[PDB]
Design an enzyme around this catalytic site. Structure first.
Site, PDB file in Angstrom:
ATOM      1  N   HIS A  45      11.986 -16.449   1.710  1.00 27.06           N
ATOM      2  CA  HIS A  45      11.358 -17.777   1.716  1.00 27.06           C
ATOM      3  C   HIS A  45       9.921 -17.635   1.208  1.00 27.06           C
ATOM      4  O   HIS A  45       9.484 -18.364   0.303  1.00 27.06           O
ATOM      5  CB  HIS A  45      11.396 -18.394   3.112  1.00 27.06           C
ATOM      6  CG  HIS A  45      10.702 -19.732   3.246  1.00 27.06           C
ATOM      7  ND1 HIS A  45      11.388 -20.877   3.535  1.00 27.06           N
ATOM      8  CD2 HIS A  45       9.386 -20.088   3.209  1.00 27.06           C
ATOM      9  CE1 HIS A  45      10.537 -21.906   3.625  1.00 27.06           C
ATOM     10  NE2 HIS A  45       9.304 -21.454   3.449  1.00 27.06           N
ATOM     11  N   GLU A  46       9.177 -16.695   1.770  1.00 29.19           N
ATOM     12  CA  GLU A  46       7.801 -16.505   1.371  1.00 29.19           C
ATOM     13  C   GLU A  46       7.666 -16.016  -0.066  1.00 29.19           C
ATOM     14  O   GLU A  46       6.792 -16.532  -0.793  1.00 29.19           O
ATOM     15  CB  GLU A  46       7.065 -15.590   2.308  1.00 29.19           C
ATOM     16  CG  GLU A  46       7.030 -16.070   3.796  1.00 29.19           C
ATOM     17  CD  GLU A  46       6.497 -17.471   4.016  1.00 29.19           C
ATOM     18  OE1 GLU A  46       5.808 -18.008   3.129  1.00 29.19           O
ATOM     19  OE2 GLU A  46       6.772 -18.035   5.135  1.00 29.19           O
TER      20      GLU A  46
ATOM     21  N   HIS B  42       8.013 -18.790  -2.475  1.00 27.03           N
ATOM     22  CA  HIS B  42       6.804 -19.605  -2.723  1.00 27.03           C
ATOM     23  C   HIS B  42       6.048 -19.103  -3.919  1.00 27.03           C
ATOM     24  O   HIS B  42       5.498 -19.905  -4.685  1.00 27.03           O
ATOM     25  CB  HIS B  42       5.894 -19.691  -1.492  1.00 27.03           C
ATOM     26  CG  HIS B  42       6.358 -20.684  -0.449  1.00 27.03           C
ATOM     27  ND1 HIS B  42       6.628 -22.000  -0.774  1.00 27.03           N
ATOM     28  CD2 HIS B  42       6.585 -20.577   0.890  1.00 27.03           C
ATOM     29  CE1 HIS B  42       6.978 -22.666   0.322  1.00 27.03           C
ATOM     30  NE2 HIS B  42       6.953 -21.830   1.351  1.00 27.03           N
TER      31      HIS B  42
ATOM     32  N   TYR C  83       2.123 -29.028  -2.932  1.00 23.92           N
ATOM     33  CA  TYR C  83       2.572 -28.891  -1.542  1.00 23.92           C
ATOM     34  C   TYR C  83       2.272 -30.094  -0.667  1.00 23.92           C
ATOM     35  O   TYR C  83       1.582 -30.010   0.336  1.00 23.92           O
ATOM     36  CB  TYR C  83       2.059 -27.585  -0.944  1.00 23.92           C
ATOM     37  CG  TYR C  83       2.851 -27.022   0.147  1.00 23.92           C
ATOM     38  CD1 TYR C  83       4.109 -26.476  -0.084  1.00 23.92           C
ATOM     39  CD2 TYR C  83       2.356 -27.007   1.430  1.00 23.92           C
ATOM     40  CE1 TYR C  83       4.832 -25.946   0.936  1.00 23.92           C
ATOM     41  CE2 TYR C  83       3.081 -26.422   2.454  1.00 23.92           C
ATOM     42  CZ  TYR C  83       4.304 -25.893   2.196  1.00 23.92           C
ATOM     43  OH  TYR C  83       5.050 -25.317   3.237  1.00 23.92           O
TER      44      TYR C  83
ATOM     45  N   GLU D 176       9.513 -26.528  -0.358  1.00 25.64           N
ATOM     46  CA  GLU D 176      10.055 -25.959   0.859  1.00 25.64           C
ATOM     47  C   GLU D 176      11.562 -25.677   0.755  1.00 25.64           C
ATOM     48  O   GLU D 176      12.027 -24.614   1.109  1.00 25.64           O
ATOM     49  CB  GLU D 176       9.772 -26.876   2.042  1.00 25.64           C
ATOM     50  CG  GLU D 176       8.496 -26.536   2.703  1.00 25.64           C
ATOM     51  CD  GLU D 176       8.453 -25.096   3.194  1.00 25.64           C
ATOM     52  OE1 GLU D 176       9.383 -24.725   3.965  1.00 25.64           O
ATOM     53  OE2 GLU D 176       7.540 -24.390   2.794  1.00 25.64           O
TER      54      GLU D 176
ATOM     55  N   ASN E  47      25.043 -10.518   8.465  1.00 25.90           N
ATOM     56  CA  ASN E  47      25.125 -11.732   9.265  1.00 25.90           C
ATOM     57  C   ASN E  47      24.589 -12.961   8.498  1.00 25.90           C
ATOM     58  O   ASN E  47      23.758 -13.687   9.009  1.00 25.90           O
ATOM     59  CB  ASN E  47      24.360 -11.575  10.585  1.00 25.90           C
ATOM     60  CG  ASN E  47      24.871 -10.450  11.413  1.00 25.90           C
ATOM     61  OD1 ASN E  47      26.071 -10.352  11.621  1.00 25.90           O
ATOM     62  ND2 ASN E  47      23.950  -9.593  11.927  1.00 25.90           N
TER      63      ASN E  47
ATOM     64  N   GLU F 298      16.893 -17.577  12.140  1.00 30.51           N
ATOM     65  CA  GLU F 298      17.610 -17.249  13.343  1.00 30.51           C
ATOM     66  C   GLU F 298      17.383 -15.816  13.855  1.00 30.51           C
ATOM     67  O   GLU F 298      17.496 -15.556  15.079  1.00 30.51           O
ATOM     68  CB  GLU F 298      19.085 -17.501  13.120  1.00 30.51           C
ATOM     69  CG  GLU F 298      19.820 -16.539  12.143  1.00 30.51           C
ATOM     70  CD  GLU F 298      19.521 -16.753  10.698  1.00 30.51           C
ATOM     71  OE1 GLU F 298      19.045 -17.837  10.337  1.00 30.51           O
ATOM     72  OE2 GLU F 298      19.767 -15.826   9.911  1.00 30.51           O
TER      73      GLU F 298
ATOM     74  N   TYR G  82      13.697 -15.996  15.635  1.00 29.39           N
ATOM     75  CA  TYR G  82      13.336 -17.191  16.430  1.00 29.39           C
ATOM     76  C   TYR G  82      13.887 -17.062  17.829  1.00 29.39           C
ATOM     77  O   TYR G  82      15.047 -16.699  18.011  1.00 29.39           O
ATOM     78  CB  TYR G  82      13.944 -18.408  15.760  1.00 29.39           C
ATOM     79  CG  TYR G  82      13.541 -19.748  16.286  1.00 29.39           C
ATOM     80  CD1 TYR G  82      12.225 -20.107  16.317  1.00 29.39           C
ATOM     81  CD2 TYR G  82      14.498 -20.649  16.775  1.00 29.39           C
ATOM     82  CE1 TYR G  82      11.810 -21.379  16.785  1.00 29.39           C
ATOM     83  CE2 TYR G  82      14.125 -21.874  17.232  1.00 29.39           C
ATOM     84  CZ  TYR G  82      12.786 -22.258  17.207  1.00 29.39           C
ATOM     85  OH  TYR G  82      12.466 -23.516  17.639  1.00 29.39           O
TER      86      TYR G  82
ATOM     87  N   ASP H 166       2.157 -32.629   8.553  1.00 25.78           N
ATOM     88  CA  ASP H 166       2.867 -31.580   7.820  1.00 25.78           C
ATOM     89  C   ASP H 166       2.827 -31.822   6.329  1.00 25.78           C
ATOM     90  O   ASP H 166       3.810 -31.682   5.636  1.00 25.78           O
ATOM     91  CB  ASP H 166       4.303 -31.498   8.344  1.00 25.78           C
ATOM     92  CG  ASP H 166       5.137 -30.368   7.711  1.00 25.78           C
ATOM     93  OD1 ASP H 166       4.614 -29.266   7.443  1.00 25.78           O
ATOM     94  OD2 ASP H 166       6.359 -30.584   7.573  1.00 25.78           O
TER      95      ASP H 166
ATOM     96  N   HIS I 222       8.155 -29.651   5.645  1.00 25.46           N
ATOM     97  CA  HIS I 222       9.160 -28.907   6.381  1.00 25.46           C
ATOM     98  C   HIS I 222      10.205 -29.753   7.067  1.00 25.46           C
ATOM     99  O   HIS I 222      11.078 -29.220   7.753  1.00 25.46           O
ATOM    100  CB  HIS I 222       8.506 -28.011   7.441  1.00 25.46           C
ATOM    101  CG  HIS I 222       7.559 -27.003   6.903  1.00 25.46           C
ATOM    102  ND1 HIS I 222       6.191 -27.227   6.780  1.00 25.46           N
ATOM    103  CD2 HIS I 222       7.790 -25.764   6.409  1.00 25.46           C
ATOM    104  CE1 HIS I 222       5.636 -26.150   6.214  1.00 25.46           C
ATOM    105  NE2 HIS I 222       6.592 -25.256   5.988  1.00 25.46           N
TER     106      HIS I 222
HETATM  107  O1  LIG Z   1       3.529 -23.601   8.053  1.00 24.93           O
HETATM  108  C1  LIG Z   1       3.054 -22.620   7.357  1.00 24.93           C
HETATM  109  O2  LIG Z   1       1.870 -22.131   7.458  1.00 24.93           O
HETATM  110  C2  LIG Z   1       3.882 -21.915   6.270  1.00 24.93           C
HETATM  111  C3  LIG Z   1       5.347 -21.830   6.607  1.00 24.93           C
HETATM  112  N1  LIG Z   1       5.558 -20.710   7.477  1.00 24.93           N
HETATM  113  C4  LIG Z   1       6.444 -20.735   8.433  1.00 24.93           C
HETATM  114  O3  LIG Z   1       7.157 -21.660   8.777  1.00 24.93           O
HETATM  115  O4  LIG Z   1       6.489 -19.468   9.052  1.00 24.93           O
HETATM  116  C5  LIG Z   1       7.711 -19.097   9.821  1.00 24.93           C
HETATM  117  C6  LIG Z   1       8.983 -19.160   8.982  1.00 24.93           C
HETATM  118  C7  LIG Z   1       8.924 -19.067   7.608  1.00 24.93           C
HETATM  119  C8  LIG Z   1      10.093 -19.142   6.868  1.00 24.93           C
HETATM  120  C9  LIG Z   1      11.315 -19.306   7.502  1.00 24.93           C
HETATM  121  C10 LIG Z   1      11.380 -19.396   8.877  1.00 24.93           C
HETATM  122  C11 LIG Z   1      10.194 -19.298   9.606  1.00 24.93           C
HETATM  123  C12 LIG Z   1       6.104 -21.691   5.312  1.00 24.93           C
HETATM  124  O5  LIG Z   1       6.404 -20.577   4.857  1.00 24.93           O
HETATM  125  O6  LIG Z   1       6.452 -22.692   4.716  1.00 24.93           O
HETATM  126 CA   LIG Z   2      16.943 -17.527  19.205  1.00 23.36          CA
HETATM  127 CA   LIG Z   3      19.535 -17.331   7.931  1.00 20.75          CA
HETATM  128 CA   LIG Z   4      21.710 -14.583   9.513  1.00 20.06          CA
HETATM  129 ZN   LIG Z   5       7.591 -22.429   3.182  1.00 20.36          ZN
END
Ligand SMILES: O=C(O)C[C@H](NC(=O)OCc1ccccc1)C(=O)O
Ligand SMILES: [Ca+2]
Ligand SMILES: [Ca+2]
Ligand SMILES: [Ca+2]
Ligand SMILES: [Zn+2]
Ligand SMILES: [Ca+2]
EC number: 3.4.24.27
Length: 316
Positions: free
Chosen positions: A142-143, A146, A157, A166, A183, A190, A193, A226, A231
């Site tokens: 995900h990162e 970006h 953004y 996003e 998985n 998941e 978290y 946001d 998000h």
């Molecule tokens: O809100 C922020 O500063 C940036 C935000 N970061 C974020 O939500 O961090 C935890 C996470 C990232 C990707 C997938 C699951 C959890 C973003 O990347 O979009």
């Molecule tokens: Ca959990």
């Molecule tokens: Ca996943």
């Molecule tokens: Ca998974």
């Molecule tokens: Zn993001």
């Protein structure tokens, strides 16, 4: 740094053992020379100064608790590089093998990860909402995605362009998770978290509404929180992507799934050829339809499925 390429071994956040590409010069560093112009992982040492120090280890064994987030950031950056190169013929995030930099142990109790314009950054979590965020391959991918967006479409953004930004990160995060094939699912985050709750995640692509995000354009968030719901409204696009790949009937609209590889091809071509910094959801639909047309033909099932998926989520 200058040195010789080595292979270390360690354990990641979830306790799994893996080999990692390192560099030896007095110490063993988290510097993978096998990919592009390198993958480099840094220790932020609980501070907010970036990048911190290039990760150094005395013996090329990375089994300490403190090591685990570095192991995973480093390894999953490699997996993500491999996905983009092998699947899309893209060399790193800029297409010209830019060095990939990540820092772990950012701040204290930090329940977030981010791309800062120049590098990826991962908190450790507070141990309740999150464990160290690099433990999630979908998070890492995900990162890094970006960064791909920023070099390509450059989606601003905020508001709809931001929600597409996003969704593109969640989509390719998920596609990378499937590539790695451990998985895999259409859920986001998941693995890292809520360690006290099994079966949950931060967002869901298959059912965004499970976690309060919209699954139809009529349910879009219109406020200012946001960055105008980047998000939140991503759920609308995430659901469309899930439908294009997996199929389904949603709000009475039936979509024939075409599978993940074709989803990835369609969205990668949309991202890199058709989207612009100001693209809105309607424009994403057009970009995806044109991309599927280029790849599979105007009369194809793939094109038809793209239209049905965007119809299902109320995007015309
Ligand atoms: O809100 C922020 O500063 C940036 C935000 N970061 C974020 O939500 O961090 C935890 C996470 C990232 C990707 C997938 C699951 C959890 C973003 O990347 O979009
Ligand atoms: Ca959990
Ligand atoms: Ca996943
Ligand atoms: Ca998974
Ligand atoms: Zn993001
Ligand atoms: Ca060691």
């Amino acid at each position: 740094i200058t040195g010789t390429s080595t292979v270390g071994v360690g354990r990641g956040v979830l306790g799994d053992q893996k080999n990692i590409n390192t560099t030896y010069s007095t110490y063993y560093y988290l510097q993978d020379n096998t990919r592009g112009n390198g993958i480099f992982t840094y220790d932020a040492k609980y501070r907010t100064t970036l990048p911190g120090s290039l990760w150094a280890d005395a013996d090329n064994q990375f089994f300490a608790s403190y090591d685990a987030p570095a192991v995973d950031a480093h390894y999953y950056a490699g997996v993500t590089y491999d996905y983009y190169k092998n699947v899309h013929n893209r060399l790193s995030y800029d297409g010209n093998n830019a060095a990939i930099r990540s820092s772990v142990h950012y701040s204290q109790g930090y329940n977030n990860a981010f791309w800062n314009g120049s590098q990826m950054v991962y908190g450790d979590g507070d141990g309740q909402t999150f464990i160290p965020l690099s433990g999630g391959i979908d998070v890492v991918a995900h990162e890094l995605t970006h960064a791909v967006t920023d070099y390509t479409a450059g989606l601003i953004y905020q508001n709809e362009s931001g929600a597409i930004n996003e969704a593109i990160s969640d989509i390719f995060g998920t596609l990378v998770e499937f590539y790695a094939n451990k998985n895999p699912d259409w859920e986001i985050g998941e693995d890292v978290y809520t360690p006290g709750i099994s079966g949950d995640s931060l967002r869901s692509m298959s059912d965004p509404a499970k976690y309060g995000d919209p699954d139809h354009y009529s349910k879009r968030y219109t406020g200012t929180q946001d960055n105008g719901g980047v998000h939140i409204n991503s759920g609308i696009i995430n659901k469309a992507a899930y439908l294009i790949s997996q199929g389904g009937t949603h709000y009475g609209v039936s979509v024939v799934g075409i599978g993940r590889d074709k989803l990835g091809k369609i969205f990668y071509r949309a991202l890199t050829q058709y989207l612009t910094p100001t693209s809105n959801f309607s424009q994403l639909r057009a970009a995806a339809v044109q991309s599927a047309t280029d790849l599979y033909g105007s009369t194809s099932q793939e094109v038809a499925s793209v239209k049905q998926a965007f119809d299902a989520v109320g995007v015309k």
